[PDB]
Amino acid sequence: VARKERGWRTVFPSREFWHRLRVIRTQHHVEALVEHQNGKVVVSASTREWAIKKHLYSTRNVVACESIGRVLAQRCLEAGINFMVYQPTPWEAASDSMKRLQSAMTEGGVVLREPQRIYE
């Protein structure tokens, strides 16, 4: 029943959500964030973290993206958040690493569609 920040139809991305998943793919590292719409960040999963560096061969490949997705899905399941949104550009959506991240989230149980607001 919480009101979503509707609008922003002329700009990208839309802000009509409660939780947003953001992926930052840098030259050396890959980060994933789950954050609220008001600005606060809920959970993080970054390749700079040692507990995954010690088992990750390379932080800038499909394996790294898959590991980040699985770890973030587990962290979100433990934190209690289940539903989010994903707003990628078409090219990064077609990118193979991101679709494997989506598969990792789905197998971990995170749903990337939020329930519609109950107005009445």
Binding site: N38, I52, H55, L56, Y57, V71, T89
Partner: protein
């Protein structure tokens, strides 16, 4: 009637005499990154975060926690770099990485995180849930 701006113009620093010499964005991702970095900066005009973003007291958030432990960054980095050196030397790990079929131990990574980066993530999550606001005032 014109009134001088109260602050620097957003594009005042960029020269325009040699705009053809200036390198362009040439891509949407670079423009998006620069745009979000700029939006994350304070401004002297009215902005969305002024009306909708939460306001925090200027005083620093007071800490009551246990004092941070000390650790030898040089030794830690040396051990980590030799560990990743042997990990990359392992050909089977490299072959799994190139075939995109390698898997990581979730229990091991979580157990190591609980000792390395667990406290800060838990503090951030509690702050997001607002416990530090309701209790402790």
């Amino acid at each position: 009637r014109r009134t001088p701006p109260l602050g620097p113009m957003p594009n005042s620093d960029i020269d325009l005499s040699n705009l053809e010499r200036l390198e362009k964005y040439r891509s949407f991702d670079r423009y998006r990154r620069r745009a979000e970095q700029e939006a994350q900066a304070p401004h002297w005009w009215r902005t969305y975060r002024e009306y909708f973003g939460e306001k925090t007291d200027p005083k620093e958030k007071i800490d009551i926690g246990l004092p941070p432990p000390k650790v030898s960054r040089t030794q830690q980095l040396l051990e980590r770099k030799q560990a990743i050196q042997e990990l990359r030397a392992n050909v089977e790990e490299e072959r799994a990485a190139r075939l995109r079929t390698a898997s990581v131990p979730l229990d091991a990574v979580r157990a190591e995180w609980e000792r390395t980066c667990g406290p800060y993530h838990k503090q951030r999550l509690a702050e997001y849930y607002g416990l530090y606001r309701d209790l402790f005032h």
